[PDB]
Structure formats: C-alpha cells, structure tokens
Amino acid sequence: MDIILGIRVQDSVILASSKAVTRGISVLKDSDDKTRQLSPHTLMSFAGEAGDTVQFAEYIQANIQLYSIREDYELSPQAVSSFVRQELAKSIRSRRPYQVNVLIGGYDKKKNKPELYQIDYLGTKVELPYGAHGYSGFYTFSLLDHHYRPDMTTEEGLDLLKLCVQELEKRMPMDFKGVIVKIVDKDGIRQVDDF
Amino acid sequence: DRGVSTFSPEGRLFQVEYSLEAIKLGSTAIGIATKEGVVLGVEKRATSPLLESDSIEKIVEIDRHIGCAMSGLTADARSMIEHARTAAVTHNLYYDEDINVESLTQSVCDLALRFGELMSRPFGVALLIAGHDADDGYQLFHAEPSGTFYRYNAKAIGSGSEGAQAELLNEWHSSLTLKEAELLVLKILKQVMEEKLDENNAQLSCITKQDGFKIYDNEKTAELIKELKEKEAAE
Amino acid sequence: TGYDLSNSVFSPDGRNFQVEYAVKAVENGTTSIGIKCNDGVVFAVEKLITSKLLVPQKNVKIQVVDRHIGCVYSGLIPDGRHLVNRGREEAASFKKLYKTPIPIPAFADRLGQYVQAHTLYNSVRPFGVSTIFGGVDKNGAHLYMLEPSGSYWGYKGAATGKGRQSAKAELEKLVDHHPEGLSAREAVKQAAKIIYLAHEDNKEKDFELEISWCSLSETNGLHKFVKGDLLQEAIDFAQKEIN
Amino acid sequence: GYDRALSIFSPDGHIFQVEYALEAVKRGTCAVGVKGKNCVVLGCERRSTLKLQDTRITPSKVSKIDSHVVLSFSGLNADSRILIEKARVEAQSHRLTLEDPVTVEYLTRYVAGVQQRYTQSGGVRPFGVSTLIAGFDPRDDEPKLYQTEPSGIYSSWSAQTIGRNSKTVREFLEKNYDRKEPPATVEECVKLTVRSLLEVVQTGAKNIEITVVKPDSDIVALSSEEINQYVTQIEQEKQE
Amino acid sequence: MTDRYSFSLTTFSPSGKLGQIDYALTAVKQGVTSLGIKATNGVVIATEKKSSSPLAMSETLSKVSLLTPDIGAVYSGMGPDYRVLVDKSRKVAHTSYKRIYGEYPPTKLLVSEVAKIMQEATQSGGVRPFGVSLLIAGHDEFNGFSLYQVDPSGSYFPWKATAIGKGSVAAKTFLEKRWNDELELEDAIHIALLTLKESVEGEFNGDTIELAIIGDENPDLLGYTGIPTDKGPRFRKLTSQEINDRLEAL
C-alpha cells in the first residue's frame, strides 16, 4: 500500500497509516486498516506488495501471540523488532521474498519508554524518534526535523502529525483517502476516531 | 519377538485376529436395511453418571447419503471417518455426483491392511456403513480390520452381537417399514445392553433418499421407546 | 545355538547355516543339467507332470538372457526367475555402455556378486536355487553353475536337483570317453539320455523333457529351444538307451 | 529410521503399551475438574514429598492453551509438555486460518487425535498422560469440560477427576454433584472442588492448587491464603 | 538390505551399567601397555611394538600416529579401531577447525572431537563402542604442553603422566614415585623407558619400542624455508638408533 508514518513522543508512539486500497484503475476501498496488534503494548503498521503485506503481518502476529501464551509474558518492543528483522532478512534470499516494509511502535513496560522501529523488506532495522516508508519521508521529514522535541506530549505529537498529513495531501499526486491514527502507550493501544 | 505381518499355521494374520477380539469388547451397534431406509443404532455405555452422554459420538455422518456406526476402540475410527469423508467429497469434486456406498466402503477397507514395519498395527474398530445410491438403493455394509466387507440386510457388531444377530435372523423380512425397523433396533439393543435402555444411553439414526442421514433427537427416540414398551405389553 | 535362525551369522564352525538350508530347497527340486560341447553348450531339464491337466510344452522352464545366454535352475522356481530378471538388467547395462554383448565369464560374476550379496545381511533370504547357465562369446563356449552361497565355477558338464548324483556319473563318463570333444548334435542326444536316466529319482510321476542349445555352427551363437523333429529324435535316442 | 511397532495387539485383543500408559496416569498426582452454572474450576494435587521447592518458577500444573482455554493433566510431566506445545501451536494456527479461536471441543479433539496417532505409529510409545481441558467457546457462556486419555478417546463431563486416588474423589463427586442444580456461583464451585480434593490430599496447605476459568477469557489462579480460607471453613462445618 | 538396526545396541542394565562400554574397557585391559609423561618443555608417549610374527615388518605398523604437526596419539586395545579413529581425527582437525580458523586445533579441542565420535558409537543405532583407550599428547600456543586420555565411553581426562592397557596399574604407581613438576624432556624419556621395561617380556630395544615426543619446533622437518613464523612441527617420532642410545644411559 502507500503512506505509513510513525512518531515517538515523551510517553507514547503514534502510527498513522493511509486508508486507500487501489487495484490499478479503481480505488476499491477507503477505510482499510494497515496495522496489526502483535501484543497489548506493541503495534505494527505495514506497506508493500499486495497480499504479501497482510500475509506477513498476520504471520508475525500469530508468532508473537504464540510466544505470549507459551511464556505468559510480553516480549519487549526491541525483542519483537529483532524477530521481525530476522524474518525479513531470511525472506530476502528466499525463492520469492516478502515485499513488505513495516513500522513497529511499542511501549516498553520495563523501561517505561516508548519505542519506534523502522524495518524495510531487506531487513534493515533502525530505531528512530520518527520514521516512514516509501515517499512519505520525502514530504514529511523536513517538518519533523524542524518541530520535533523529545519531550512532546501526545497532543502535540498529533498536531505535528496533522501538519505532516496536510503537506502530503497538498503535494502528493495520489489520493490516499486520509489516515487511521493509533496511539501506543502504557495503557495499551487505542484508535483516534476523529482525524 | 515376531513380525506384525506374520501368518499363523492356520493361514490367518495374528494381528488381524487379535484386533477382532478388541471389537468383541466394544459397545453394541446395530443396522437394519429396508426399502424405506436404513436404520443405525448404538449403545453409548457411559463409564460414569457424571459423563455427559450426548458427547459420546458413536454414530457419524460421512456424507448426506452415507452414515456410519462404530464398535471397538472408537479412537481408531477417527482417521477412518476422516478418510471416508475426504473420499466422498473428493469423488464429488472429480465427478460432480454422489459416490456409491460400496465404493466408499471399499476405499475405507483399503486402509485396513496397510500396517507393518504405514501404521504400526491394524485398526481395533469395526464399522457399519449405511447409505443410499441410485444404482443399488438402500445398502448396509460391515467393514472389518481384515480389509473384508460384507453387505447385510441386517447386522449387529460389538459385545452383544451373536445374540443380536440370532434375533435379527428371525425378525428381518423384505417388507419391513422404517418405523418397524426403528422399534426392532430398540428392542434388540434393550435385550443385549447391561443397563436399562433409555434415550440417554442409546442413540438412533437413519438414512433416507429424501432427507438423507439424520441422528435422532433424544425426545424423538424417547417416544419410540414408549411406543415399544406399550406394544410389548399388548400381548 | 541360534546361529541358524538368522542369515549372515557365522556359526562357531565358520558356516552360514541359512545358506546351507537354501541348498536343501535346491536338492528338493527337479533335475536340470548342462553339457559343454565343441562349439557351444546344451541345457536340459526334467519337468514333472503333476496332472493330466497341465498343457504340454507350455510351462517353459529354461530362460534366455540377452540373445546368446541360456539359464536353467533347480529349486524354488520364482527365485530363479528373480535371478534371471536381474541377469537381464546386468546384460542390458553392459551392452549399453560397452556395445558388445556381455561375455559369459563377465555375466557369471554379475550373477555371482548378486547372489553373494544375499548372504551379507539378515534382512534378506538366500536364493533357493542352483543355476546352470552359459553360452557363446568371442572366446568360445562357456558353461557355469552357481550355488546359493554365490559360489560358481566353469564346468565341462554340470547337474543339480534331486537326481544330480546319477546325472554327474553320466557326465563323467562322457568326459572320459571323449577327450577330443562332443558335437552339438551329440550333446543334445546325450542330454536327453541323462535326464531320462536321472528321472529314476523322480519315478513316481511321469515327466516332460525340455532341451535348449547355443552353438556356433548349429545356431549361429544364439540361444534356441530344441523343437519338433530334433526333439523327437533325442527322445527316441533316450528311450532306446533306457531299454 | 526406527520403525519398530511398539503398540500391538495381544491374543486377548489388548494393546498393552496403551494400557501401561494408563498405569503411568494412575501414578500421577490427582487432578479434578468441576463446572458450575457460569464457571469451570480445575483443582490439582501437589505432593508434599518435595519441599525446598521454589514455587515461583516450578512448572505449574494448569496450563493456558489460549486466553480462554486451559489444560491440566495427570501422568508423565515431560510427556505433557509435548502435548501442551502442540495444542498451543494448533490454537494459534486455528486463529490464523479460521479467524476465530478454537472451541473447547475442537482443541480436545486435536489433542486426543495426537494421542491416538502415537498408539499406531511405528517407533513411538503412547503418551503416559490423561488431560482435563476446560474453558468457554468464543462468545458463549456455557461451561465446557472435557477429558482425554492415552488411547485417544475423549468425552464431555459435568465433573471429572484423573490420577492417583481418582476413584475416591469420583465417588465423592458422584454423590455430591447434582445435574439439575450445578454450583450456581464461583464460591460454591471452588468449595466443592476443594472438598473433593480434601478426600485424598493430606494437609490443606500448599498441596491444593485451584484455577477458576470464567467466560470471556477470565482466568485466575487462587493463592495459598484464599484456598486456605476454603480449607478452614470446610472443616469448621465438619465439626458437627 | 538397508541398515535396519536403527536402535541402540548399548543400553542401561537394571544396575545402571552400560554393558557394551564396560566390555569395551575389558578389551582395552587386554591390550598392550602404552604410556604418556608430561615434562616442563615437552611430552613423551610410548608403547611396545608387539609383532604378531617375525616375518612381519613391524615398522609398517604405526602405533604412534601424528594427528597434527603439534599433536600425536597412541593407544591400547583393538588396533583396527584405533587406525580408523586416527583417520577420522586427522580429518575432523581440518573440517571442523583448520578450514574455519586457518590454524590447527588446540590439543583439548581435538581431544573433544575424538571424544564426541567415541560417545556417538555408544548411543547411535546399530553400532558397538570403539574398543580402544587413547593417549593424546600435544602443544598449542595458549595452553602449552598437555596430555589427555580418552576412553570408550567418550570421557576424557588431562594427566601429568599415566598408563593404559595390560600393566597400567603397576605402571601408574611407578610414575607416581618418579614424576615431579621440574622434569626436563630427557628426564621424562628416561622415566618412560624405565616404566615400559617392566611390562615388556621379550626383546627391549629400538626395533621393539615405539616412542614419540611433543617438544621443540623442528625447522629441519618443515620441508621449506622463507616464512619466519612457520618454524616446523613439534611432534617427532624417535628413530630406532635414538632409542638405543638412551638405553645405554639406562
């Protein structure tokens, strides 16, 4: 699919993902949720080749849920991101690689810190205060480089995110039909239903 | 020790003959074929009163036109049922039609002698396979762990089988109605069962051309038991 | 004890009892022979007529390998057929790679190694046959006999089955009385006689005679069955000698 | 590969390896399951031959297969881990393909199938384990309790016990459990489960474990003190 | 065909004994005596060349074998089992080490690999244990000189000095009285020859005794010159003459 954004503020991680699904000529859907909850305090958004995106995301979800049941314990965001990276690094030298890029937003309950990880389909992992995939970064990073502070509130993070989406809606040729925004903090994962 | 596929001096496979002994210890199952349908009945035989008896599943659907009852080591039947269901559905996929009851039975019986040193031993369960097709009408087959299957007008398997089969010898005729067959299975089950027969420790089922395979409700069977009691008291 | 319960086990003697038991099955079979002549070989076998219902001349026992080798055996008939099937595969692969038809000594070792391999493991049973075989190659005529152990040697004459002692004695007379050699046509006649003489060990039931031959002059070095007039002539010669 | 047929029939039509696996279950610590009107309780015996045990880290007897289903057992502890792992993998596989968590009956049918397979496969011995599987089907408030055994047969139970001295506690349950009126509350159900174990256990101290499963993935394990209060109240009513 | 023995031939008996391992050790006990002594600047390993026939050329039968340029081995027990273990040990030194790290393995790790092979013949399907005990002497940069014993079970132990086989009990007592932590290599060779004489019945000379050392680097045995860091093998087999020279000062 198209635009996925992430920003890590003081006490939470915010993920924004476009709602459009386009199959060549027509926009088949304008309310698609490009994310999967991996654990109560870990969320993964995704974009890439059709079919492979959801297949990969659900495969990861199943594996983390299996780990959670086996150990009666939630893996740290860092541990989950490393597992996901290895799967993509394995995939890139397969017969038919997963063409999927992901952002992993998680709140570490042990360290009481939000964490945002950016991983591309090659298995290239980086921890960032804010990130994106595709062309999304080309339009938004100059705004984030200017306004971002590590001590921002969640509300300030959403406002900076709105400015990023507005710039995308102005200069991007494709109509991505707005974004679904989700917040990851100490209390878990919730969706902002008005954006 | 000795081979699993060894012949005895009489020309019988030891393991097959021994599995037949396990089937003799199983709960009773009875089948009666008529021109109006085939009836299948079983003894549930719960080991304790705290065991919820409606979870005992000894009568099973293979397809809409084929049912099946079991006796012996009933856990062994699960892979046989799975194969039967797959074979029935697969044939419909390949040929856009219902599979013949005999052909389904033959497919199940092909699994039987696939043991050695494939599975490590024969199945310890016998099956009564009942159904209907357009070519041969209403049919009842007895599938054994030897790989042999006989067609029957009526048949009983399990612990009360030889007493039940003698009773079926006298009672069966070519003009039996479906209702008459239902009462007859209930009558003979009641005869050979240890505990007193009711709707909770016995189960009925039938296969008709119109309605297909149906397992009877406990309320429906309870009425047929009451009808049986009254007609036996009638003389 | 227990050394004889499993194949490939050495007894305290250094013997493989299972192989020795396979020999007993061979000794129980019908009599078969082989005669090496001047430019070829002759094979003959006793076929017991168990019943009148057996169709005469139909249940053929002697088998051809390639087009120049004949094989006959005594003991368990199916085991012999299995060995000939392998022999046919060996001969085919030899000719495939090397072009020339397999030489008889080469063919002998192929059967020998295969039979020997069935004495190496307890997961297989030894062959219940002794096989007499041979034919004509570039170096001339060759006759071989192969036992259940895998052991084989070249022979001037060979015999196996229930009437082997009788047959051997008859073969030994021919070797002594003909140091210069025997003709192919003579060998067919003599083969008929020897089978008839060896039939005294199986005198209860009557039998059917079956003969084949490979000769450089008589069959162009190809294996052929003796049929019709030449077979009858050999039967007459044989019947005359027993009376 | 090792292909030897270990589970085979005997002249009297018995498979001894399967029957000897049941003897391993008889040796295992007692496990009990009781379903109320709106709950299921799983009770387990802990043999007090082992003290100096670290109870924080020692493998607990009741295992979550999913957030809504639990599994307890009697028999070989090492064997049970293999069944628990397979059940957990299948639970996630079901969610992945059907997009719905397993029913309690389905999960039972799977575990029972694995057990059966190990009774007619070459080179393997049967599991020396019987299991009690309890929980609630997704979006359903009807309690579920099933039992499996080494042969692979399974069935549903209003109340059931397995393991050593299970004959005694089944005797208790058969006279104390009424089907027309099951334990209406959590309290009543736990009380009846603790009572049933007290027929067999010894000291009511750290020897009894209790796990309560309610609808909608509500599963909690009772502590020593909470169970101790049930143990206290039961005997004070008994002194009469 | 196919190997249908996929099950263990070594199993625990009711008393907890592994019968086949015990019996393998009994075969080692019947074997000819071999010994090893560690000095401050070297290690010596020795054994008797028990010739089966005087027509046999006993020089063609090597009981003391080079495993790597700095590691040697000797045995007691079944000779054929030893020979194949030497082949496997030489190969595993390359496949599991030299082809990875570009250098020969340290003594303790090569011993560990040989031990693993012997352990597996004690658990794997359709095989019996090896009927040998090995003594492995060697040197490497970071561990210095070392001597190890490996048994049929796969167990291994490091020794200052030891003996295995026929007269090991008497030989170990003899070594306990003579060994100290200040021995030079020549002293250890002298003690080795003294110890070995007790277990030998017949002829005792350079032709009936096999002896090798792990000592100084031998640049004369390297086969090439030009690379300063390459200084030659530390393993050296003593000649018949070299043994006889030390038997006069005996």
Added chain:
Amino acid sequence: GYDRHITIFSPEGRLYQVEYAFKATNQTNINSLAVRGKDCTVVISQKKVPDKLLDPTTVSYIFCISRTIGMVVNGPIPDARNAALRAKAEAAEFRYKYGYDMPCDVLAKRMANLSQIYTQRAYMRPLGVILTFVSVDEELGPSIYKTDPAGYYVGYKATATGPKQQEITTNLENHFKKSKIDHINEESWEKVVEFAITHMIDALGTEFSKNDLEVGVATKDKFFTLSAENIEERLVAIAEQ
C-alpha cells in the same frame, strides 16, 4: 546370548563373529605363501580340483587387481570375489582421483578399513577371507601386505596363510635367520618362484605336479600369473638339482 550373533562386545571384550570369520578362512583347505626377491614379489597357492566335471582353468584364488597389484585370497570363493571386485573398483577410482597408481599398502589399508567397519556396524557381516596383496611398489619396492576379518593389516618380509600356515611360517623364519636379510637375494623371478615352491615342498612334506600349484608374480609395472607349462618348467629345474 545375542552378543555371539552380531558384532557387539562379549563380557570379555571379544567379537565372536570376527573370530568365527577367521575360521571360515580355512574352509577351502588351501595354503598360500608369499616372498620377496630383489626386483620381484612372488606368491604361490595350492590348487585343488576335486571334481572331474570342473573346468580347471576357471578354478583360481589369485586375482589381478590392477596392472601392478595382485591379490591371493584364503577363504570361500564368493567372499573372495566380493573382495576382488571391490579392490579393483577402489584401485581404479584411486588412479582417477589422484593421478597415480594406487600403492599396494594403501589398497591394503583401504580394504582393512572396510573390514573394520563390518566389525563395528551390526547390519554388515565380516567377510570370511584373508587377503594378501603383492606388488613391486615404485617407492617401497617389493611389497607384501595382508588383511584379515578383524580389519588388521601389516607389511611382511614374507608370509603364509592357510591350515598349515605355522609350518610354512617357521620354515621361512629359519631361512631368514640364516641369511640375515629381508629378501631372497636372487636376480631373476624364475629362481624366486623356484625358492618359493621348494620351501613349500619342504614345509608341507608334499610333492607337486604342474596342476597342484598356482603362481602369481609381481615385477616393476606388471603383475601376472603363470600357466601350467610355465610352472612345469619351474618344477623340472627344481628336480634337476
């Protein structure tokens, strides 16, 4: 007592199947002898053709393994030919892979290793044969290397195998005790064959005709067997002095 049926240890640390394979070695009742000259290696073996129906030219226990290597076998012919075919295959493969002729001692080691495997692996039985390999090696010169069912092998100055090996062995020992050298100091192989036959006659106490013996000779770059008429010429020379 299944420790006697397969190759596992007995309580005494013995392998009975290996010991019984050594006994099968003498089943043919044939004795063989091998000696080394200056330029050659000679091997002689008794030849017994007990049946008149046999073709005597096909009765043999000496094998031409490669151009340079010969092999005499003591034991039943099926196992002998099994070992012969394998040795031929190994020698040919060696030349293909490593670019030079397989040495006699290296082939002996290889066959000894194969034999060792049969003593350790249960599904394979030992071969009931003793294999004596001979050649004139390009590095080591005249060579005799002998393998047995235990997987043991060693080089020999001379050697003997069979039911009466001890008598021949002692006879050879006594000669080399006199001469104090490791070989027969003779130029021609003909005279080395004559030595070999003479000392077998002395040791066994039996006379030989041309059909009672079987002879193999190894020289530089070839191994060959003698015909009956070549052996006859040898026997005549022995009798004339």
Added chain:
Amino acid sequence: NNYDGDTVTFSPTGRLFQVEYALEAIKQGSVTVGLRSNTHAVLVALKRNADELSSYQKKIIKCDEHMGLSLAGLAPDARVLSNYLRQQCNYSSLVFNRKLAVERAGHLLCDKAQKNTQSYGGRPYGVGLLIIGYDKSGAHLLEFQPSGNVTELYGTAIGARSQGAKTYLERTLDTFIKIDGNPDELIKAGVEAISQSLRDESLTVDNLSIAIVGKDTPFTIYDGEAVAKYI
C-alpha cells in the same frame, strides 16, 4: 517351529513356513473352478456368505476385456494383485497398442509375489488366483500360488474340497477340450465340475458365480438370475 517367525528364514529341511501358512489360507477359502476349450475359457466360483442376512462375497474380478480371474483366500490380497494386473494390461495397451499375453501376465504375478518371500518386514500374499483369458494364441487358463508358482492348465480348481472338481476335470479332459463354439456346454461342464466339491449345500441363484471369455466374447461375469439357466 523356530523357523516360522518371518518369511526371511529357511527351515533345516529348506522349507519356507510363512509361505506354507499363506498357502493354508487358500485351502480355507471357498471352491472355484477353471476350465477351457480351444475357443472359450470359463471360471465357475462358489460364493460364500457370512449368514442369511449377509450378501455372498464376490469371487471373480475383471482385469481387461480379454482377461480376468477368480480368487480363493484373503480377498484384499486379490484386490491388490488384480489391480496390478489391471495396470499391466493397461500399460501394454497404452504403450504398445498390444493386448497383454496371458502367459506374460502369469510371469508378472510370479515376480510380484516372489519379492514378498525373500525380504524382511513383508509377508507373502494369502490368496490363490485362477486367471482365464483369450489372446493371440487362443484360450488360456492359469493357476497362481502365492509362493510365486504359476502354471498353465487345461482345467483346475482351488479352495476347500477342490480335489473333487480336479479329479472330475482329469477324467473329462478329452471331452471338454473339444467343446468348441458352444459356450453353454462348456459352462455346463464347469458347473458339473464344481458340483463334485459341494457338501450339504447346493448351487442356488445367489450362490453361483460364472465368468466366460472367448473368440468373440469379452470377459463377462454372470450373477443372480443370469445363472438360473445353469442351476
């Protein structure tokens, strides 16, 4: 005794007991007869029921348009071997456009059965077969034993009490071989032959099973009222 635990073991007299035990299963089986003339070949089989409610076990199996057999012994083993014959007949037709010779079909059955008598783990087949067919050399009748032994005959019988039918055919040899161009009379001779093996029971309409193949006659099986004509 000590040598009957598996098929891979000869006895001290050179016998294979597992094979002999498999042969015993045939003797317990119901009687079936085979006979032929120069134009036709006929199978007659006495079918066996479990009881009066049960059907009569089928005995005759079609392999091709020109070939088929009758069984006596373990029925599932006959299904395996007949399936193999169906495949081999089929391979011959598809690859070579050639109807499989009856003699060659016998050779293939022999070799398939032999492999189960020389290897560990397996077991011999527990069934005997009578194969009839019409090919390029006329009518044929074969007898198969699970030892591997296959024999071409004018007539024969296998199963329980088969000796009575076999003696009758041995007497009638000169008569029934001459029944050319008359299918009904050849079947009559077969029905009369199998009657020499009956005791207590007689040939009824659901008891009797007949098969025939010939010059201008595809392999066809007669059951039910189709055999009432011959009762």
Added chain:
Amino acid sequence: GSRRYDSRTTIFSPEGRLYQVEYALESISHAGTAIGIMASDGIVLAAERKVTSTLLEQDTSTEKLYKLNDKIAVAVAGLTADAEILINTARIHAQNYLKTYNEDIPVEILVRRLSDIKQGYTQHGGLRPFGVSFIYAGYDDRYGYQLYTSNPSGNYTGWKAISVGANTSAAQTLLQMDYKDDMKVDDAIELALKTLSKTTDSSALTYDRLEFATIRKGANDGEVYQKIFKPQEIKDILVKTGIT
C-alpha cells in the same frame, strides 16, 4: 531379521515406568555429588570429582561445572561424554535465541529446551537415553536468581537448594535443615562445602577433589559475574570455612 536384537529402549513396564530412564537414574546415583544453593545475592555451585589421582592435571581439568553462557552455568552428574553433547546443544540454543531476539535467553526457556530433547529419547527413536542429570544455575531480569534440575526422563523442577548424584537423600536432608530464605552467598558457600564434607564417600574433603563456582551480582553495579574457582581458590575457601 533385526528385530531379534532390539532392546526396545522406549517402552513402559507393567507398572507404568520407563525401564531405561529408571536404570539411567541408577547410573547417576553413583556419580560424584553436585550441589546448588540459591541465595538472595547469588547462587553457589559445588561438586565432587570422582576418585582422582595425583598425576591428574587439575588446573586444566573440567568434569563437573560447565559454562552455557555468561549468565547460566550447569553442574553435571552422570556420563561426562553424554553431558558434553547436551551442553553444546544448549550453548547453541542460547546463541540462537540471542540472535533472534537480541536478548539473553531466560533461564527456564533454556532448561525447558534441553529437557524436551531428553524427553524425545524416551518416547521415540529406539535409542538409549542420556545418562545425565543437570543442576542449572542462572540469572535473568524476569525471575532473578534461579536453580533448576533435569534428569533423563526430561522432567525439570525449580529449587532453593538441591543435590544430584551420590547420596542425594542424605545431602537433601542436611540442606533442608540449615537453609533459610534470607541467606547470603557467603553463608551458602559454607553450607554447600559442609554438606559435601559430611556426605562424601572419601576420607576427607580436599581442594583437588572439588569443583566450585558462584554466580554473583557481586559484579561492579547492575550486572552478573560467573566465577569458576581455581584450584588455589578452592584451597583458600576450604581454609576460610574451617574444613582444612
């Protein structure tokens, strides 16, 4: 065929016991005693080498105590060769986990993995089980200091103090008597050595007959240190605790 010679290593007895597991446990009861004691500020591992010699090179010798990673160690009782096979597998599993999740493997997960391998040899394959019992001493940030044991059956349990090998009945009674929950490492060191000194089959407990190890947060600040004691260091702690 081959069936004749099969011991059938993976069958139940009529009583429902696994023959080979029981017999392997009998083997382990003759091995040198190993003891583990868990304290609030660390874990102690103490073990007795079996009847040694004066010519054994002790300082380079290891038969009892093995390092699995920087946080986890094991004490061995049984066949040493069998133990090294499993130890190498455990070391690999720990590294596999570290590579996958970029975190050190939790102690129980490693223990469960090795225990499952042992279990497999009792249920399938027809091979003899491993004649080894382990004591696992380890630390992770979830449960802190942990002691586990596993045996040839593949069953594992957690402990405050535990012994394996010879004289476990006597050793366990002595530990049960003197162990307290608020105990410290230095006290636990003394208890372990005192217990071995009383249970040993040797005449006296000396440095050359012992292997010793501690896992302490006595590593400078917020980290854990493993200490495999040297021969001289075992000699010193024996004098300090007043045994020699």
